Design a protein around this ligand. Sequence first.
Ligand code: BCL
Ligand code: BCL
Ligand code: BCL
Ligand code: BPH
Ligand code: BPH
Ligand code: MQ8
Ligand code: CRT
Ligand code: HEM
Ligand code: HEM
Ligand code: HEM
Ligand code: HEM
Ligand code: CA
Ligand code: CA
Ligand code: CA
Ligand code: FE
Lengths: 59, 60, 57, 319, 40, 317, 280, 258
Amino acid sequence: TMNANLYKIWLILDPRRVLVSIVAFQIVLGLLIHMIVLSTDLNWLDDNIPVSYQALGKK
Amino acid sequence: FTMNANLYKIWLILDPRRVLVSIVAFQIVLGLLIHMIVLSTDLNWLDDNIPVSYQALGKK
Amino acid sequence: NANLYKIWLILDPRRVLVSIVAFQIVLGLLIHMIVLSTDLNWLDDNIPVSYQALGKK
Amino acid sequence: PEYQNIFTAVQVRAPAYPGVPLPKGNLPRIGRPIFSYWLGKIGDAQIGPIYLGLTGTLSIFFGLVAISIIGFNMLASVHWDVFQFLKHFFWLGLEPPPPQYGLRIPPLSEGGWWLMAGLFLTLSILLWWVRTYKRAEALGMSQHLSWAFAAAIFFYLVLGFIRPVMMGSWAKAVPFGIFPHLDWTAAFSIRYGNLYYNPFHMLSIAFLYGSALLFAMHGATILSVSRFGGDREIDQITHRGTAAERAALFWRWTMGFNVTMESIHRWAWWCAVLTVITAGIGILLSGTVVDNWYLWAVKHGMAPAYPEVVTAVNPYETA
Amino acid sequence: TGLTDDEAKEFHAIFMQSMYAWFGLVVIAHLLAWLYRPWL
Amino acid sequence: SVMLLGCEGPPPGTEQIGYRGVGMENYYNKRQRALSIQANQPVESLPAADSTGPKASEVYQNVQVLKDLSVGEFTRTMVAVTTWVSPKEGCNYCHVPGNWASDDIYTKVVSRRMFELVRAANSDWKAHVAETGVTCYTCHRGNPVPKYAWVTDPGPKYPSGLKPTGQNYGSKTVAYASLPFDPLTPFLDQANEIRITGNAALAGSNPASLKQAEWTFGLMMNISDSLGVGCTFCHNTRAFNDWTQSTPKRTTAWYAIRHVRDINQNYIWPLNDVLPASRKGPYGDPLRVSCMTCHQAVNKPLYGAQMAKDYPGLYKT
Amino acid sequence: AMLSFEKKYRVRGGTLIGGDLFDFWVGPFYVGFFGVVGFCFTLLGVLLIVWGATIGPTGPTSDLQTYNLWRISIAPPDLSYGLRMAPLTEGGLWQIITICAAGAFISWALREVEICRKLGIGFHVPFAFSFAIGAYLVLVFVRPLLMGAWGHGFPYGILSHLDWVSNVGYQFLHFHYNPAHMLAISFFFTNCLALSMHGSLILSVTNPQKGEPVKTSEHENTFFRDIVGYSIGALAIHRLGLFLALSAAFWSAVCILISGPFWTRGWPEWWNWWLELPLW
Amino acid sequence: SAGITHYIDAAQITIWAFWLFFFGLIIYLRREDKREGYPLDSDRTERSGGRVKVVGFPDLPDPKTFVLPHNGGTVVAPRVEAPVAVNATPFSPAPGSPLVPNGDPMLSGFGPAASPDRPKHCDLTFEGLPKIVPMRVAKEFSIAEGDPDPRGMTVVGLDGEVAGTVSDVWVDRSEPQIRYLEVEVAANKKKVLLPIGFSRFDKKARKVKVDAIKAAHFANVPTLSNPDQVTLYEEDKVCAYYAGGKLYATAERAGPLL
Ligand code: BCL
Ligand code: BCL
Ligand code: BCL
Ligand SMILES: CC[C@H]1c2cc3[nH]c4c(c3C)C(=O)[C@H](C(=O)OC)c4c3nc(cc4[nH]c(cc(n2)[C@@H]1C)c(C(C)=O)c4C)[C@@H](C)[C@@H]3CCC(=O)OC/C=C(\C)CCC[C@H](C)CCC[C@H](C)CCCC(C)C
Ligand SMILES: CC[C@H]1c2cc3[nH]c4c(c3C)C(=O)[C@H](C(=O)OC)c4c3nc(cc4[nH]c(cc(n2)[C@@H]1C)c(C(C)=O)c4C)[C@@H](C)[C@@H]3CCC(=O)OC/C=C(\C)CCC[C@H](C)CCC[C@H](C)CCCC(C)C
Ligand SMILES: CC(C)=CCC/C(C)=C/CC/C(C)=C/CC/C(C)=C/CC/C(C)=C/CC/C(C)=C/CC/C(C)=C/CC/C(C)=C/CC1=C(C)C(=O)c2ccccc2C1=O
Ligand SMILES: COC(C)(C)C/C=C/C(C)=C/C=C/C(C)=C/C=C/C(C)=C/C=C\C=C(C)\C=C\C=C(C)\C=C\C=C(C)\C=C\CC(C)(C)OC
Ligand code: HEM
Ligand code: HEM
Ligand code: HEM
Ligand code: HEM
Ligand SMILES: [Ca+2]
Ligand SMILES: [Ca+2]
Ligand SMILES: [Ca+2]
Ligand SMILES: [Fe+3]
């Protein structure tokens, strides 16, 4: 649908700005996710399983 | 857009580059702003209710 | 993969390169940490044995 | 009633000068330099462009990370409710690890993000000193910034790697917030005697003063004789003139002795460096060395002695 | 800007296929996690 | 987030705590020192006592705290112990409609204790309470529930199970500053050490975490605020520890920081059972006692007025 | 004596309020109508104070009375004598000294001016110095007045004057939150940064790499146009400077003129007007 | 610390350290301070201080070699200098007494309007062309979009009465900042460079008042050898003049007020 009349977009918007702005946004945003999520209950690193190989092996 | 049809004129006084880009940002921020202000107090599906078992029950 | 090549005609390859190299250096230094900090501190805490705990004492 | 070089009255402009080109290795400069009449009503109205090498990016990256931590964890605090984040801003922050994990990697929670974020404001900061010496001499320029930067970067480490980690305490290392950080200095003064008694601070002060003094004089002086190209010091350094003539002379018939359009710039770079130098000094001694500088002082015959119109009692003794 | 209509439409096309490249690789990403750890 | 110039017109207060030109000084806005007095006013005691009569343990079915008192004097007490406490609800507040010997009212149960509180205090800690001693008007100042209590502060909201730090916030608790925002509970309630000064000049002594003195501060803040006097008042700054250097006041505060230990860990604490929820805190607790609770930003609650002196039944016998 | 080229500037006159009399030099200093006076106060101070060093706390005999800069200090009178001459022994002397020191900085300050005239230069120097001068008044005058006490100022102790701050500072608990003290501090910092840059850069262009030309602005104006991206300019630095400092001072000046006579609560509190905003 | 010896520990050592290397580096500067202008000239007085050394306690440093830019001689320091003239007479023979500017002081070239003889070679830009030039060659420039163009502003003596007008405002290729304004005087019908530093803008009346020298003095203003560029030598030359005005343009100025 959108694509046909959306090529004209790059006719006012520089390819570099979109290429540069998007990378910056996708990554910082990507980071602010696992990040804001990691600190959230569904944490995965030290939250639950697999079997406490640390608690078992350590002591 | 019964009235917002005669608006066509605006574009010359409102630069396309200035209005296009700048508004795509205000959105890019408010996007996070809202999800944050709402995620903060209203309800927090992330730590509000189950599934939140694996964290406590699944942990130890 | 076919059409992906054309990107080099608008963006300075050297740029994206040095850009990528710096991105993978911090991240890795981050991850190993962001994990070693929480997931499994494989370095100090479980193995092999406590030469310090059962030894020093 | 003479135009006292305050704000460049009438300005003028010419194309964007992307500086002297660089050798084989210094990647392309970047940016489409801009102009700001206002900013320019004080200095070079042109803006940019700026360089960005490896450490350039590498450092900047290691930069907006700690920020994205010390920034995040902070917001989290006021439970992601910005409104208050905005309110309790100057109060918020991110504290270090609890006295337990003295040096051990703190858990993902208890002071963890701070050690994480910290190290990333440990490298990027140290990496940016590289983004100097590097871009510095690759200009055919000697090194005096790079130098000082260290002196300063020294003190920063005297507030971390070198001392906090030197006393086994992921606590003895400053917090991470305006107020709280504003508190650390407060807390410190106490925990150990009272800094006003550790010479290396009462010292590092006189400097933070001198700079607050000199670069404050020579800033004027220059101006005073800025009509006579004083501002052009560059050449005045080489080919003198009425500038350095009228100037130094002033101080000659004032405080007596005086110096040169060169020399001054020396003491400048010095007092400055000789500041953070003395800073990290005391801060390094204070901790693993003397524990109470007030006691130190008097014990050396330093600390004064006044009469006594008020005194108290001591429970631990009578009780 | 800095271009004409020709070069413009060509970019947009390839540029799209590359965007659906993401959405698909990310949606499939979400889904894989969605199966493992259910959020909500 | 902007620069400012004092919002109080001069000239202010002027107390020279220390030797001519040394430091410790004290400044207060008259325009406030005023109101604060004209407002923190004591309510004149009841008319003279009877002196006559037998006792009260005698005539009254059950009167343990005020048994030695003559009926009349004893009654003065009830009246007082009303206006000082709930002169909005009347006698019935601590009693049942009619039957006065009833102990079917948690208000009374405690009221009882509140008596063992005051007196015990007024007589055994006179080193802090001195001759002004305390009354019910103090903490209750015309109110059943002291507006100045303090349930262990939960802290600000929790981020997905993750907000351990208890320093950064800013809460009136501490004259306003990013601090523990609750030095009380671990101090005024419990009794965590408060000293941190290294006893000897060099190292090899005080191994106290800075963080530790980092807490003393907050505490100290509150204290200093409660009474409403700068640390100069009890301290000689450079000498936060050199007592020989401090001022009388200090020691006079020392005890206080224990008479409270007492009051909380011995009285207001136990009585939590008889106390409903509306007086219990989130972490489940009893509104104990801050120095503020009485002091209310003053040095001698109601600036030295000694109400308790005009009530004999308010002193351990 | 004279500098290699000084011999040619020592014109005649140029004085301010008279001075065409003592309008001459001594060593490398111009006297005039102010080099003269300032001197007076100097000894009737630098030495008048000696008397103090002699006298000490109790008396010139008290084991308390010493001769170690580290301890020696002249203490102001008790708040008692409010805005009145105190007994030298009890306070006045302190006042006396301070009396002098005032002029000694008002003279040398002005003397600077006469000079600034002779050498037909700009006056940015004195004008600057004045702030620094002032900050000394609004910190032993403008304040103590709105405190009705001269003895309410500060001492004159090599380090003794330190505590005087220690106290008056804590008199508000966390003095640190004082809005001014924050900025005023910030400046005394920014200054000590730019300075640690200009004075550096220069000494890095005029004396650049080995076998290299005395670089030109065509570098400087780019040195930071690379690292930081933008360059305030060269003329500018010698502006931002005076700015920072001549502000930092005037700031701090406020900083302690309002602390007390304009605010009695602990600063930390002042910061409350913020919180209480009908918004968050 | 003032008495002699009391306590004894570690850190107190170090305080001695820095506070030693300081008194060392202090000298370093002293020397580096002396480069130019040294040694001193006359015996009008001796060296004031603790130890009155021959000429400064820190033995004058050695020659420094300044490798100038392309097509430029080399400068050093110290570097003996050839004595100059003293167009003035001592009001008094007393050491430290002033020297009156013989004849017309306005140009007598003394103190208030004296100056050194800087190199007679226009200081150039980065590659070659000379930095300070008039807006003539400085054609690739443009007034700051907004600031009222000074080209056409009538200068006005400190006496008020007009004194010629302006022409080209000598910009610079190094920093887009105006440094001079061409002033086609009124009587001389010549060109006298106006040192912006001395020029006070009055964008309200197109004027540019200069409280430095009377309108007439624009005639005695050191004339520029070439109008398309100015050399360091003269860069100091034009300036120094107006400077004098500060203490010459009126009998008032120079003499005390009270
Ligand atoms: C949270 C629960 C799950 C989990 C669920 C998810 C989910 C769900 C997703 C991820 C995704 C990602 N996860 Mg994960 N993840 C977990 C644990 C981890 C851990 C870990 C140590 O435990 C790590 C290190 C990661 C790391 C990562 C990243 C590799 C990845 C992308 C993020 C992003 O912002 O892209 C942003 C992108 C960009 C900046 C680049 C722009 C993209 C375009 C198309 C390419 C640019 C074109 C250019 C012009 C051409 C030049 C080429 C080169 C640049 C030179 N996850 C846990 C177990 N993770 C995302 C993903 O991988 O999707 C596929 C995703 O959707
Ligand atoms: C609140 C409880 C719900 C929830 C409710 C909502 C609601 C309600 C809404 C969202 C919306 C959004 N949510 Mg949600 N959301 C939840 C959980 C999540 C989680 C999560 C990890 O748990 C994530 C990652 C998201 C993520 C998102 C975003 C996809 C989306 C828009 C964001 C934005 O502002 O960009 C902003 C915009 C721009 C940058 C630019 C403007 C767009 C224009 C049209 C095209 C760009 C044109 C340009 C000029 C051309 C050049 C192209 C390139 C820029 C180069 N939600 C929970 C479960 N979410 C919003 C949404 O998706 O609406 C569709 C919305 O309304
Ligand atoms: C109690 C401890 C408090 C505190 C209490 C105070 C108090 C109390 C005061 C300050 C003041 C100041 N503090 Mg504080 N301050 C604290 C911590 C700090 C910290 C820190 C990093 O921790 C910093 C950076 C500062 C910074 C500052 C400055 C902004 C400010 C002004 C100093 C000044 O230069 O006056 C400039 C002064 C002068 C120019 C006068 C002296 C010069 C005269 C004119 C010439 C002398 C000639 C001589 C006699 C002749 C002999 C020749 C010799 C060779 C010299 N404070 C702690 C928290 N601070 C002061 C202030 O605000 O003043 C306005 C002040 O009163
Ligand atoms: C006596 C020594 C004085 C001193 C010297 C000194 N400082 C220096 C130097 C020197 C010699 C440098 O060379 C260096 C400099 O400026 O180099 C160009 C510097 C410097 N001194 C600085 C700061 C500083 N110096 C201070 C003090 C001092 N420095 C002393 C007074 C102070 C204080 C505490 O008063 C501060 C705050 C920096 C400006 C700079 C060092 C910069 C550095 O290392 O940067 C590393 C990279 C980053 C931090 C990444 C930045 C990320 C992005 C570019 C910004 C994006 C926005 C941001 C994250 C805001 C948040 C927004 C969010 C919504 C995303
Ligand atoms: C922001 C402004 C900064 C500044 C600027 C500044 N200072 C200046 C100037 C300027 C522009 C000068 O022009 C002037 C100068 O050096 O001129 C050649 C000067 C000066 N700054 C000086 C000092 C000074 N400046 C300081 C600070 C600052 N000065 C600020 C940081 C400080 C401190 C503590 O921070 C000091 C100590 C002097 C060296 C000099 C002014 C000299 C002068 O006029 O002296 C007159 C008097 C005497 C030589 C004899 C003294 C006899 C008196 C009767 C005794 C006074 C006693 C005193 C009050 C007690 C001191 C004891 C303390 C330890 C408690
Ligand atoms: C027992 C016993 C010994 C008792 C003592 C008894 C005694 C001695 C009694 C006598 C007491 C008396 C009368 C003392 C007064 C004696 C006098 C006149 C002392 C001099 C006073 C005085 C102000 C000295 C200077 C103070 C100092 C050193 C301040 C340091 C601040 C500082 C770093 C200044 C920098 C100085 C310099 C290098 C200035 C030069 C300088 C500057 C600053 C430029 O900006 C500039 C710009 C462009 C070209 C050139 C220059 C230039 O040359
Ligand atoms: C949610 O956030 C959003 C997305 C909205 C973005 C906004 C972010 C914001 C607003 C961020 C704001 C950040 C602020 C205001 C930060 C302020 C910081 C301050 C005031 C800091 C003050 C002092 C800091 C100091 C002294 C830090 C010192 C750190 C040190 C010494 C770190 C050392 C680290 C070392 C030595 C690491 C070594 C590696 C290991 C630990 C492995 O060695 C054993
Ligand atoms: C003015 C109205 C009041 C009257 C007439 C009144 C009357 C009495 C009487 C007659 C007794 C003794 C009864 C017995 O046990 O035999 C008594 C006891 C008591 N009253 Fe009241 N009372 C009044 C108000 C209050 C109030 C407001 C309180 C609340 C704090 C209170 C607290 C007590 C207590 C604690 C006792 C037990 C005394 C003791 O143990 O020493 N009374 N009252
Ligand atoms: C001797 C006079 C006093 C009497 C008769 C008295 C009486 C009472 C009563 C009846 C209650 C329970 C009220 C209710 O909720 O129904 C109460 C609660 C309380 N009192 Fe007192 N009191 C006296 C003095 C004090 C003093 C001097 C303090 C201060 C340190 C104090 C602190 C408290 C506190 C903290 C509570 C708990 C708050 C509540 O649950 O309402 N009281 N007092
Ligand atoms: C807000 C400013 C204040 C600060 C920063 C402060 C700080 C301190 C510190 C650090 C200590 C421990 C010293 C040591 O033994 O190592 C201390 C102890 C003490 N302070 Fe303060 N203080 C303040 C206000 C006050 C006030 C207003 C009083 C008086 C009522 C007071 C009374 C005491 C007492 C009695 C002790 C010793 C007993 C103890 O608490 O363990 N302080 N203070
Ligand atoms: C730990 C917290 C507290 C501290 C540090 C403290 C400290 C002090 C100090 C230093 C004084 C003497 C002031 C002076 O000499 O002028 C004082 C007086 C007094 N305090 Fe407290 N106090 C505390 C808690 C309390 C509490 C909870 C009460 C209430 C029951 C109280 C009631 C009083 C009264 C009535 C006086 C005045 C005695 C007089 O006039 O001499 N204080 N307190
Ligand atoms: Ca949920
Ligand atoms: Ca392990
Ligand atoms: Ca803290
Ligand atoms: Fe300079």
